[PDB]
Structures are given as C-alpha cells and as structure tokens.
C-alpha cells in the first residue's frame, strides 16, 4: 500500500509568482476605492520589465507605477546586483476597459445575487484530513520551505539569499480505504537564487541545517532521504532575468500540488465575478466543510458555469472511498447547504475585500483562516 | 452510480491559444534549422499586440516578425473588422539567450542521454478506455465542437463566425469498478465571436443544427439536454481585444479536461529539455500503453524531476480500481519498460522534430498518432 507523491512550491520572487502578486496588488488597489471594480489584470515579467495587460472598469484612481513598484519592493528586488530593482525597472501598461459585450452579458442591469458567471469554466475544490488545515502534506512542506528561505533572507541570517526560489517534496504515504497517511519524506529539492560570493558547500549545508531541519519534522527524515540542494550547481542569475514570468502559471502551486484536480483557471488579477477564482474558493470551502464535518476523510468537488448564467451547470463529488455515504448522498448534502451562484459566493466569502495580494504566494488554501477556510456547519 | 463531469475546449483564435500557437511556431522555426535549439518562448496578446518574452539559445536565424504574422494569418485574424490583423498588428520582441547558469547545470558538456532535466517539477499522464483514442469523451466532444466552428468559418458556410470560441460539455456517466461509461450529454455551452450583422436567433439555430448535430451523436442528445448557445447574448469584440492572452493559460484544455491531474507546467514554446512538456508527453505514452496493453481500463501516472538531474525523482500509478494488478505491480511494469530520462524520451518520442505548432490547439493528446499516442508493447 506504500506509494510516493510529489508536490512543489515557489518563493515570492519566482518570476511567475511576482506576476501573481502584482496582479493581485492591482486588484486590491482597485477594491480599496471601488468594491465593484471589474478587474482582469495580467502581468508579464522579463529582465527590467513589468507589463500590465488586460481589462479594468473601475471608479478607482490607481497609480500603476506606485502599485507595481511597491509590490516588487516587498518581494525584495531592490538592486541591480539582485537582477531586478523596483526603483529602476520599466513599468508598461496596456490596460483597457472591460469589453462592453462581456459587461452587458454578465452584470449590467443584474441584481447582484443574480449576476451571471463572468465566464464559462470548470473548477475543483479538495480537502484531506492528513493535516489539520486539510491540505496535502507534500505541498504544505514545500510552501513552508519557501517561507523559511524568505524569513532567513529578510532577517539577515543568510544574506546571500535572493528572492527567487523553488522547492519540491516527495512524501512516502500509506493508505487506508482511500485516506492517506504520511510515513516519511523520500526526496527534497531546493533551488534558490544566490549571490556571487557564497560557495556551493556553504549553501548546501545551510539549506539542510537551517532550512530543512527548521521546517520538516525529524520523524520524517532518515538515512535514506534524498536531498537535491542547489542541484543545478549555480543560480546567480534569477528572477525575471533568468526566466520570463506570467500571471497564472503556478496554478497547481496555488491549489493542491497535483492532488485533487484543476479546471485550468488562474486566480490572480480577477475580481469575484470571474468564477475561475470565486467558484474555486467556494469549492475549497465545500470540500473543507465535508471533511471537517466528519462526512469523509478526503473529497473532491467539481463545479462548472456558463458565461452570463448564475447557477452552476453541474456539481460533482468524488470521496475516494472515504465516506460511508455515497457520492450521490454527499452531492445532495452539498446542494442543500450551499448556493454556488457567484452573487451569493461574494457575500458568503466577502470577496469584495482587498485581501488578494495575501493569497498570491504560498498557496490560496490552508492558511490564515480566510472565509473559504472556515467550515460551514452542515444540516442534513 | 450516475454522475456528471464537465470539460471545456477553446478555438484557435481564443487569445490564450493564439499565444500557445505562436510560441510553438517560434519553437518549430528554430528546430527546422537547429534541432538542439534551447527555447523558452512566452507569448502575450492584447489589442494590436503580440509580445514575445523569454530565452532562446539557437544557431537558427529566425525572422520573428514573419513567423508571428504567419501564425496569426493561419488562425484567421486578417482584418481590423475582426478585432485583430496579422498584417498591421505590433510584434514586440524581448528575447535573450538562455541563462548560462541554467545551461551549465542542465546540458553543457553532458552526454545527451544523460542531460539533466531542464527544471524541477511534477507531471501526469492519463488514459481512459471510454474512447478508442483513450481520452475523456467530455473533452473530445468539446475539442470537436471548436474544430467544427473553424471548419464552417473557413469553408464560408457560416461567414459571420470569427476565430475566438469556447465550448463546454457536461456528460452524464455511469461507472463500473472505476471505469466510466458515457450515457448522455447533459449540457453544452458554445460561445463564439461573430460579426455585427448576424442576429442571436440565427446564430443559436446554426450552432444547434450545423455545429452540435454535426459533432455529437444523436444517441447522447435528448429532450432534457440543456443548451447554452451564445449565453452572453453578444460577442462581437473578441480575440486579444476582448481578453488578454498568455502562453500556458490553457493547460487543462491541452491535457485531460479536468480528468486525471496536472503538475502545472505549460507545454508551448519549450524544447524537449523542459520536462514540463517532454515528461508529460512520455507520461501520456505510459498511461496509453497500460490501457491499450489491457492492464487497466483507466490510469494516472505521476513523474517528477530535479533541475540538472536526469532520472526522475519519483514515479507513481493510480488505476482507479480498474486493474487486477496492484499499483505496486503496475509501477514495476512501468520501470521495466520505460526510461523517463529526458535524454531518452527525446529519442523515443522524436522530440527534436518541428511538429509542435500542430499540438497547440485541440489538445496535445488523443490525435494524429504522434509518437506519444503509439502504445509501447509491454514485457512482463
Ligand atoms: C529552470 S527555469 C525554466 C526554463 C528557462 N526558461 C530556460 O530558459 O531554460 C524555471 C525556474 O527555475 C528557477 N531557476 C532559474 N535559474 C535557475 C538555476 N540556475 N538553477 C536552478 N533553478 C533556476 C527559477 O525559479 C525559474 O523561474
Ligand atoms: C470572458 S473572457 C475573461 C474575462 C475578461 N478578461 C473580462 O474582462 O471580463 C474569457 C474568454 O471568453 C471569451 N469571450 C470574450 N468575450 C466574450 C463575450 N462577449 N461573450 C462570451 N465569451 C466571450 C473569449 O474566448 C475570452 O478569451
Ligand atoms: C491513494 N493514492 C494511491 C493516490 N491518491 C490520490 O488521490 N491520487 C490522485 C491524485 C490526483 C488525482 N487523482 C488521483 C493518486 C495519484 C497517483 Cl499518481 C498515485 C497515488 C494516488
Ligand atoms: C468515477 N468517478 C465517479 C469519477 N472519476 C474520476 O476520475 N474523478 C476524478 C477526476 C479528476 C481527479 N480525481 C478524480 C471524478 C471526479 C469527480 Cl468531481 C466526480 C467523479 C469522478
Ligand atoms: Cl517555473
Ligand atoms: Cl479564457
């Protein structure tokens, strides 16, 4: 019954993640002034460049240069020695209003509760009782390794660190009637951008002793655990200079690390009417409510929409064999307890609040008791 | 045992898909001259603009203006009345060489068979016996609906059609010990860009009679099937003008339509050393080989890598209950029959061949007998 499973995560300065965080900084800036802003902000990053491209209709007055540069500053790209600098990079803007054809079909002259979905699409929610926060251990550990690197960079413990990083964790699990039980960590990868002066051995020793041991419980690590630390051997060039980044290119890091499923939609840079985000958050809320409600140990929820239509077109449940109730019965419980119209999700999950930049690194789920992480008490 | 499942697809002129096709036109142009080109070409599309951003090291001499414009011409954006024109759009290039830090850690001075993975990451392959081509019926039908729209546009049957389209199909399935059996089509969505003169009723009638009936077998359609045809009511503005597109924003349309799983990596614009593409193609090849070999009715394969390391870090199998063999036994059969080092996959799947633009619309799998679609005869 033993098997392996692998998940990855990336740091705040990974170029795709920079784009997600800037897209969400833009969204938050609009929502602080206009809770009903319609935002579809894509970000592209390459050497010396942040480009914003997309569609925004809003009553807010947003200074894009300031918002972009402040987000890059927070990430830590503040000097040409690091490969990118918020003070001196190019910020280019290609933003137009939302298509009036989309606006008239989705929200114009619609009662909020009855607003149409902002697009068609499919979305999934997942939860697993293997951790208290109901997330896969593989991705929780991968996120925490990136967070630890940023913590040691910011407190000056390891001043050779730069903001761009990636981690990957392979866990060996056992299973019991579809539930999964972590046994040990089989393999860890860490790659992180660094300065020109630190040597490989110093970095590898610090990554094992100050990063991995500070995050992964010793009970999961043994003589057979495989460590791939700075496996490329050199990572001085990094950030957008090493690799072009785009918004919505880390959708699996944003969600379940390979577990569960994904409908394809990106979260960052989108207001609640874009069901790629709101319905995925609601589906996480449903899945976590079923697991914390004791109805199943693990569960996957699919939902889908048509542009301009409020009610979902389909809802489906997969319990991996971890419920005594059938998937049909669980689906009936979901339909009796949840209303997944976007105009209802916005109220239940408070989705006009400008907390989106906080979601754009380290995963959107299993952290900070955001509304979609607080289970709903189920009646049946 | 009945349940619903939904998948979507998009047309060649969907703005994200335009980007994938241009990224792969660039890759093919390089591979036609330099089979060993290192390509990481992202594309961004917004009103009047194609931007190329990324990293290419190649001995080829490529005329980016010609390659981009020819790809847009093929798609059908050839006039300002359609919202985008290959003859007159802006083509901007932000392409640099591959990072020397990546090159030295991945491939420089390495025997080809022993080249390192071009990045860390996780990838999945999936196959299902529900169709001859071993793909989910939901996504096969969704792709064929987009192909039919492009066919009727190009042959002048429905001259009001434009290249930007989306479709979505919900199938009602039965199940038998983990295998899935399609029963009927529950809901179909079609949204397609159109000219200013055609009315909604004309479009809805043509979509049902000339598109859906020409693709979906009548046995799946009944009095209860729900049709959402042009549900937004108006879609004159389209393509990049209606919505900014980016490479690698249709990764679920490119693969299994929500079924199976995804590791997060985008395919288009990348040469074989980027395991996001090559290892996902090899994992599809493994999954299809297990199903066509009669070992299981449905199967999921995970693989993972570390940058600079040739052998995968992990391989895992999930058979959904559709094999008499355990997942451990199937994994042993996979390890005895396949070598998933990128420098071996390139040879088995002929991945230096410039056929990538052909993969960049209508899904990378279940079509055209590409090498990853030809099962390997298994020994055990
Ligand atoms: C390996 S790059 C993708 C391939 C790249 N576009 C190329 O031209 O080969 C993906 C991510 O890996 C990380 N990376 C960049 N340079 C690296 C290096 N020298 N060693 C390890 N990881 C690196 C960064 O997080 C980057 O965004
Ligand atoms: C609905 S748009 C995404 C949201 C958009 N960025 C916004 O500003 O609201 C996603 C895709 O839907 C399609 N689309 C564009 N305009 C549409 C319309 N008026 N009706 C239906 N689908 C449309 C195109 O394929 C487009 O790429
Ligand atoms: C309990 N086991 C054995 C697994 N549980 C899962 O949920 N999935 C899985 C993950 C994502 C989508 N579909 C299924 C697995 C996937 C693989 Cl490749 C291997 C093992 C498992
Ligand atoms: C056989 N049935 C009942 C299903 N089979 C699947 O393979 N998955 C599935 C799809 C993707 C990832 N993990 C699992 C399902 C997912 C849902 Cl939400 C509902 C039903 C099924
Ligand atoms: Cl990456
Ligand atoms: Cl889209």
From Swiss-Prot, chains A, B:
Q: From the record, give the cysteines joined by S-S bonds.
A: none
- UniProt xrefs under InterPro entries: ADOMET_SYNTHASE_CS (IPR022631), S-AdoMet_synt_C (IPR022630), S-AdoMet_synt_central (IPR022629), S-AdoMet_synt_N (IPR022628), S-AdoMet_synthetase (IPR002133), S-AdoMet_synthetase_sfam (IPR022636)
What is one process in the GO biological process aspect for this record?
one-carbon metabolic process
PTM sites of type N6-acetyllysine: 66
Q: Which GO terms describe its molecular function?
A: ATP binding; identical protein binding; metal ion binding; methionine adenosyltransferase activity; small molecule binding
Instruction: Write down the chemical reaction(s) this protein catalyses.
Output: L-methionine + ATP + H2O = S-adenosyl-L-methionine + phosphate + diphosphate
Pathway recorded for this protein? Amino-acid biosynthesis; S-adenosyl-L-methionine biosynthesis; S-adenosyl-L-methionine from L-methionine: step 1/1
Keyword 4Fe-4S on entry: no
- Where L-methionine is bound, by residue? 55, 98, 243, 274
Q: Where does K(+) bind?
A: 42
Q: Spell out the Pfam families in the cross-references.
A: S-AdoMet_synt_C, S-AdoMet_synt_M, S-AdoMet_synt_N
- Region described as Flexible loop: spans on this chain: 98-110
Q: What CDD domains is this protein classified in?
A: S-AdoMet_synt
Cofactor(s) the record lists:
Mg(2+); K(+)
Taking the record's annotation, the residue ranges forming a coiled coil are none
What else the UniProt entry mentions is: Protein expression is regulated by post-transcriptional regulation: in presence of S-adenosyl-L-methionine, METTL16 binds and methylates the first hairpin of the 3'-UTR region of MAT2A mRNA, preventing recognition of their 3'-splice site by U2AF1/U2AF35, thereby inhibiting splicing and protein production of S-adenosylmethionine synthase. In S-adenosyl-L-methionine-limiting conditions, METTL16 binds the 3'-UTR region of MAT2A mRNA without methylating it due to the lack of a methyl donor, preventing N6-methylation and promoting expression of MAT2A.
The protein, known as:
S-adenosylmethionine synthase isoform type-2
User: Which organism is this protein's natural source?
Assistant: Homo sapiens (Human)
| Lineage of source species | Eukaryota, Metazoa, Chordata, Craniata, Vertebrata
């Amino acid at each position: 019954g033993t098997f392996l499973f692998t998940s990855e995560s990336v740091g705040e300065g990974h170029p795709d993640k920079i784009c997600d965080q800037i897209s969400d900084a833009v969204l938050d800036a609009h929502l602080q002034q206009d809770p009903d802003a319609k935002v579809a902000c894509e970000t592209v990053a390459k050497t010396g460049m942040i480009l914003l491209a997309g569609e925004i209709t809003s009553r807010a007055a947003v200074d894009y240069q300031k918002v972009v540069r402040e987000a890059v500053k927070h990430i830590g790209y503040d000097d040409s020695s690091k490969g990118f600098d918020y003070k001196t990079c190019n910020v280019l803007v290609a933003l137009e209003q939302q298509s009036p054809d989309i606006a008239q079909g989705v929200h114009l002259d619609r009662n909020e509760e009855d607003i149409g979905a902002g697009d068609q699409g499919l979305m999934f929610g997942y939860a697993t009782d293997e951790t208290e926060e109901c997330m896969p251990l593989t991705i929780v550990l991968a996120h925490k390794l990136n967070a630890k690197l940023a913590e040691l960079r910011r407190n000056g413990t390891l001043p050779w660190l730069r903001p761009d990083s990636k981690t990957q964790v392979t866990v060996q699990y056992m299973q019991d009637r579809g539930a999964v039980l972590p046994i040990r960590v089989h393999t860890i990868v860490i790659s992180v951008q660094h300065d020109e002066e630190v040597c490989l051995d110093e970095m590898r020793d610090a990554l094992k002793e100050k990063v991995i041991k500070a995050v992964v419980p010793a009970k999961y690590l043994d003589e057979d655990t495989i460590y791939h630390l700075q496996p490329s051997g050199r990572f001085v060039i990094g950030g957008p200079q090493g690799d072009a980044g785009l918004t919505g290119r880390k959708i699996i890091v944003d969600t379940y690390g390979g577990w569960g499923a994904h409908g394809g939609g990106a979260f960052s840079g989108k207001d609640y009417t874009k069901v790629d985000r709101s319905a995925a958050y609601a589906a996480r809320w449903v899945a976590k409510s079923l697991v914390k409600g004791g109805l199943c140990r693990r569960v996957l929820v699919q939902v889908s929409y048509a542009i301009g239509v409020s009610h979902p077109l389909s809802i489906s449940i997969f319990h991996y064999g971890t419920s005594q109730k059938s998937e049909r019965e669980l689906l009936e419980i979901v339909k009796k307890n949840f209303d997944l119209r976007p105009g209802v999700i916005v109220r239940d999950l408070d989705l006009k609040k400008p907390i989106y930049q906080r979601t754009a690194a380290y995963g959107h789920f299993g952290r900070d008791s955001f509304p979609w992480e607080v289970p709903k008490k189920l009646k049946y």
